[PDB]
């Protein structure tokens, strides 16, 4: 029963010494415009790619934009606009043509089809396409009738679109409103107790006040629903930073549970003055279970919670060594690390990928919350930051996270403002270039 | 900014050298009888206590049973039974009297109030009680009209109740049916678009085919909903066992990633013959990422998946040592371990509690699935087994999990049949008595 440990990830596999060599889902958005279909779409895609499921959004609009000169006006969308309708349907099918090949030919696991899909006919077209390609179909319908909520959307993300460039806000608003009503007359909402008894679907009502959920067929559907109950749209601020410089940092040594240096403590102190002058009605503070992050918290005189998930990557046998010592003592290891930094796992330790598993609950609580300061470690920080700035696995292990700097993230429109704030206290540079 | 590492759990805390010294929720069940309110109740309570939230079920029936001679008949439940109604309400309030003191005075975090609570009046009584004690209120309503489903319930769990002892099945069925109809006339289901717009609630429809979810106020509510989308009632079998004996077991050494012994391999082989003769239409196999469990899988010639969550408890600095060597080299540690085995964490390693965090995703997939063989390790196995047999944290680190034995668990009525099956291959006994 012979077996052999892979070199990068360190998984055992069977020696098989002419070497010969879960269906995908289409998440189908449904709803009138200005209902946050693209926002829910981007945000799910960011989640799924980050918990490792490959996912791509296929927004029918962008196809229309690649297809058609420059935005005339809402007249384009009139149901009597015979030729627009032809061109719009054509865009719809090109989107599907590309969905088929993302999922049947490039192994993506989920495609989000971001289109109004407000008519039972169109939804039968998609369902059919799903069947003949052995794709699952999941519908997320966002349904809301509050003019406040729509006006809001139209202001935050529509007027500032590409289609409007040549336009003052005033007119781009009236044009969109009229454009919404082009869908109003034929909109048939999803109905579980009628024409849609057999559809796997979630209906989001009034921006998450309420949900109708039908026929959850697999984990990934179940996890979408869980995600959707945890997100919200209240405005807020996520602050991320590392522990102030620690003894090991000063010796240039990795891992361990060392405590703050002198400069460490000064930064703790600077951070307190920093939070105060942010003037935040409320704020949660999180740390790891390591001394560094906890001492830094103590400086703030605010209450905090430790998360084992936040502990720095485990360097395994290499714990407490310096990078040079690692090159001298284990050359095979260092090389492999350098050519695959995301998947490389230390002997008896961890990999960035391992973090992302570990840190999923942290991501899920951050979505739940409002203002949060997360005091963690360099690799941990890189992960979180990847989630939030939609960075890839390829670039994650190289995102820059200097000591004594604070990262201030503000969810906004379609993503995140990110300001940097250096608190003016010297430290060692624990980076090493994208090698 | 001085700090000190606790001895058991090894958490840093602040030296504070006259030492001076999230509201709770009431989950309110709602529905007609034979709707699985007690089943959902037990099962949630098992989950929550196991992810560490203290939780207790307060079923109004059992109070009625402590209050009233012996079960006459359904006449007890007639709405015109003036005196029963008085006594039943009294039971209801004693249940609440005990809920108040579990949550305000014994720090439980959740009480499940398992009663019909089918009338808006009664639900106002409870809501009121919640307000004046600053308890949250969450309603889980199970709603189903299929006679198959009710008959089923009545057969699996009602006729075999205490109340019926003096009775053949035939009559206990008619008596319960008549008893259901005592509630039918006054039943007002929860309605989010009417009298219950403002209630945090989940409505389970047709045994999970469909769900209505309103006003999820916190993580624990969000997590209940997630749990409820993952459970099911299809019958199936969970098989648990450890890897066959490994080299370290033979040296009597803990941790490491050693491979199977001779006897190890024989047991792998015996396990294959064991699965075959179980004759299971389908079966998932899971292992850890350690060689032992993986080699054992290889023997089965069935496809399997490795879970890092399943890896054995990390003994930290004590990895690869023998228990004697651990006593000789670290006496302070050994003692602490012996007096708090669940919370004790090895230096730079783990605690049983840590496992339970780690293993939560495994529990959640097991609920999703049907037949599953889980090949893991001694401590991992103890945890899983605690979840399934509703064992406490106090007894978990001492549950017996011999080598080369298979544990066959069958969900049933209100819990789990557990058979043992020893596959007749000698090994070393890696236990050590409840000390
Ligand atoms: N209509 C509309 C929306 C809009 N203009 N922007 C949106 C952004 C998101 C969205 O869908 C949501 C999905 C889930 C939630 N989740 C929650 O509210 C949870 N806190 C409820 O459990 C909220 C909104 C809906 C909208
Ligand atoms: N009526 C009724 C029930 C009955 N006789 N026994 C039951 C046991 C549980 C129950 O509530 C459920 C809660 C969640 C589920 N979950 C599911 O079906 C998921 N697979 C759906 O996402 C199923 C049933 C309901 C019942
Ligand atoms: O991802 P790489 O380049 O290995 O850097 C991660 C390193 O960051 C460190 C310092 O270099 O954490 P920290 O935030 O505690 O200062 C080490 O513990 C860890 O190995
Ligand atoms: O919980 P305690 O009593 O420490 O026993 C756990 C021990 O079980 C072991 C063997 O004793 O696992 P395994 O199932 O691989 O045989 C060790 O790895 C581990 O330390």
CATH superfamily ID and name for A234-435: Phosphoglycerate mutase-like (3.40.50.1240)
Contacts for B337 with CB less than 8 Å, ≥ 6 apart: B344
Contact A311, B314 (CB under 8 A): no
Task: Map residue B83 onto helix, strand or coil.
Answer: helix
Which of A46, A67, A183 is closest to A117 using CA atoms? A183
CA dihedral B158, B162, B164, B170 (to 10 degrees): 40
3-state class (DSSP) for residue B430? coil
Distance CA A346, CA A337 (A): 8
User: In this complex, which of B14, B265, B294 lies closest to A12 when CB atoms are compared?
Assistant: B294
Is A366 within 8 Å of chain B by CB?
no
Taking the CB of residue A237, how many other CB atoms lie within 10 A of it? Answer: 17
- Residue B212 and residue A148: Cα distance in Å, rounded? 25
Distance B254 CA to ligand 4 centre (A): 6
Residues in chain B: 435
Q: Catalytic positions of A, please?
A: 114, 144, 243, 312
Which residue's structure tokens are 């206290």?
A425
**What residues 188-247 of chain A have any CB closer than 8 A to a CB of chain B?**
192, 209-216, 219, 222, 225-226, 229-230
Q: Do the beta carbons of residue B126 and residue B117 sit within 8 Å?
A: yes
Cα torsion for B378, B383, B386, B392, to the nearest 10°?
Answer: 110
Breaks in chain A after residues (C–N exceeding 2.5 Å): 17, 21
User: Which phi and psi (to 5°) does residue A342 adopt?
Assistant: -75, -40
Tell me B162's DSSP state.
G
HSE value, Cβ hemisphere, 13 Å, CA-based, for A65:
9
| Strands A25-30 and A110-114, sheet pairing | parallel
- Ligand 1 atom with the shortest distance to the CA of A231: 16
Interface touch A368/B219, C-beta < 8 Å: yes
Strands A415-422 and A405-412, sheet pairing: antiparallel
d(CA B311, CA B305): 13
Give, in degrees to the nearest 5, the angle at Cα A299 between A298 and A300.
Answer: 90
Q: For the domain bounded by A23-233, which CATH number is listed?
A: 3.40.50.300
Residues 6+ apart with CB under 8 A from A362: A286, A307, A309, A310, A374, A384
Which residues does B312 contact at the CB level (< 8 Å), separation at least 6? B255, B288, B290, B376, B377, B378, B379, B380
Kindly report the protein residue whose alpha carbon is nearest to atom 6 of ligand 2. B36
Resolution of the structure, angstroms: 3.0
Ligand nearest to the CA of B380: 4
- Check: CB of residue B37 under 8 Å from CB of residue B31: yes
**Distance from C-alpha of A116 to C-alpha of A88, rounded to nearest angstrom:** 11
State the DSSP H helix or E strand holding residue A27, giving kind and residue range, or none if neither: strand A25-30
Structure-token pair, residue B244 = 């066959």
> Measured on CA atoms in the order B181, B184, B190, B193, is the torsion positive or negative?
positive
Phi, psi (deg, nearest 5) at residue A143: -130, 120
CA distance to partner chain B, nearest, from residue A86 (Å): 37
Rounded alpha-carbon distances, angstroms, from residue A103 to A56, A66, A113, B158: 10, 22, 12, 49
Per-residue CA distances from A326 to A258, A334, B45, B397 (Å): 19, 7, 49, 37
Q: Name residues whose C-beta falls within 8 Å of residue B170's C-beta, 6 or more positions apart in sequence.
A: none
Phi (first) and psi of residue A58, to 5 degrees: -125, 90
User: In chain A, where are the structural domains located?
Assistant: 23-233, 234-435
Does the fold of domain B234-435 match that of domain B23-233? Answer: yes
> Which residues contact residue A407 at a Cβ distance below 8 angstroms, ignoring those fewer than 6 apart?
A239, A240, A241, A381, A385, A401, A418, A419, A420, A421
Contact A373, A285 (CB under 8 A): yes
């Amino acid at each position: 029963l012979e077996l052999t440990q892979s070199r990068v990830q360190k998984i055992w596999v069977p020696v098989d010494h002419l070497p010969r060599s879960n269906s995908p889902t289409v998440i189908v958005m449904v709803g009138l415009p200005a209902r946050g279909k693209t926002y829910i779409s981007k945000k799910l895609t960011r989640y799924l790619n980050w918990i490792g499921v490959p996912t791509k959004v296929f927004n029918v609009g962008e196809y229309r934009r690649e297809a058609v000169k420059q935005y005339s006006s809402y007249n384009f969308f009139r149901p009597d606009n015979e030729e627009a309708m032809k061109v719009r349907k054509q865009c719809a099918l090109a989107a599907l043509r590309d969905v088929k090949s993302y999922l049947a030919k490039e192994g993506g696991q989920i495609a989000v089809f971001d289109a109004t899909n407000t008519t039972r006919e169109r939804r039968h077209m998609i369902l059919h396409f799903a069947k003949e390609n052995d794709f699952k179909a999941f519908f997320i319908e966002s349904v809301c009738d509050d003019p406040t909520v729509v006006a809001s959307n139209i202001m935050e993300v529509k007027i500032s679109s590409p289609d409007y460039k040549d336009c003052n806000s005033a007119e781009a608003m009236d044009d969109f409103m009229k454009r919404i009503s082009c869908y109003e007359a034929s909109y048939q909402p999803l109905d579980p107790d009628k024409c849609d008894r057999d559809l796997s679907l979630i209906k989001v009502i009034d921006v998450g006040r309420r949900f109708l959920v039908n026929r959850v067929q697999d984990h990934i559907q179940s996890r979408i629903v869980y995600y959707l109950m945890n997100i919200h749209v209240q405005p807020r601020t996520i602050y991320l930073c590392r522990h102030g410089e620690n003894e090991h940092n000063l010796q240039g040594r990795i891992g361990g549970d060392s405590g703050l240096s002198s400069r460490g403590k000064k930064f703790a102190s600077a951070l307190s003055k920093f939070v105060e002058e942010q003037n935040l009605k409320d704020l949660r503070v999180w740390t790891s279970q390591l001394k560094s992050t906890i001492q830094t918290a103590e400086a703030l005189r605010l209450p905090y919670e430790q998360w084992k998930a936040l502990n720095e990557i485990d360097a395994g046998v290499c714990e407490e060594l310096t990078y040079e010592e690692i090159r001298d003592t284990y050359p095979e290891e260092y090389a492999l690390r350098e050519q695959d930094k995301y998947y490389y796992r230390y002997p008896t330790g961890e990999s960035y990928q391992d973090l992302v598993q570990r840190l999923e609950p942290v991501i899920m609580e951050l979505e739940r919350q409002e203002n949060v300061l997360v005091i963690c470690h360099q690799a941990v920080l890189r992960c979180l930051l990847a989630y939030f700035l939609d960075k890839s696995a390829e670039e994650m292990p190289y995102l820059k996270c200097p000591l004594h700097t604070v990262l201030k993230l503000t969810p906004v429109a379609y993503g995140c403002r990110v300001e940097s704030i250096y608190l003016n206290v010297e430290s060692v540079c624990t980076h090493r270039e994208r090698s």
